[PDB]
Amino acid sequence: FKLTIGMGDLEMLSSTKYPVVFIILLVTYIILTFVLLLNMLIALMGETVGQVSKESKHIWKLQWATTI
Amino acid sequence: FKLTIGMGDLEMLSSTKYPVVFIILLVTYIILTFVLLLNMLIALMGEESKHIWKLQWATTI
């Protein structure tokens, strides 16, 4: 978790006896983490850039009626 | 490379004889790297609307 933010000390690499695959696995972990976070980022930005969508706010009217 | 994730410590900028221009050349490095990394992601992982949901699902059948 600390390495995901950018505060992780690379000390577990020497912990394992097999660093050649461990480093590759770790690097894939950060690559996938960034891919997932940025996919979420574009998801939010595309959802919020339109403001009012055709399918959107029909949901909102639905929950408003349901709550009433 | 560690600067891209931020793990590595940035004590190297204290050794340059011209910190005024090294910092400028490093800020543009970070911006260029971030843009160049974001572009491939938005080009590959992103991608008409239901084309994928139709074709990729029909492939499984």
**B18: left (phi > 0), else alpha (psi -120 to 50), else beta?**
beta
Contacts of B7 (CB under 8 A, 6+ apart): A3, A6, A7, A8, A9, A10
Contacts of A12 (CB under 8 A, 6+ apart): A22
Can you tell me whether residue A52 is helix, strand or coil?
coil
**Which amino acid, residue B43?**
A
Contacts of A58 (CB under 8 A, 6+ apart): none
Q: How was this structure determined?
A: cryo-EM
Which member of B5, B41, B45 has the closest CB to residue A30?
B5
Resolution in units of Å = 3.7
**Which amino acid, residue B28?**
T
The Cα–Cα gap between B11 and A59 comes to: 53
Contacts of B46 in chain A (CB under 8 A): 39, 42
Contacts of A23 (CB under 8 A, 6+ apart): A13
Which member of A10, A35, A42 has the closest CB to residue B7?
A10
The encoded tokens of residue B46 equal: 């992103």
> A11-38 burial, b if ≥16 CB within 10 A, otherwise e?
eeeeeeeeeeeeeeebeeebeeebeeeb
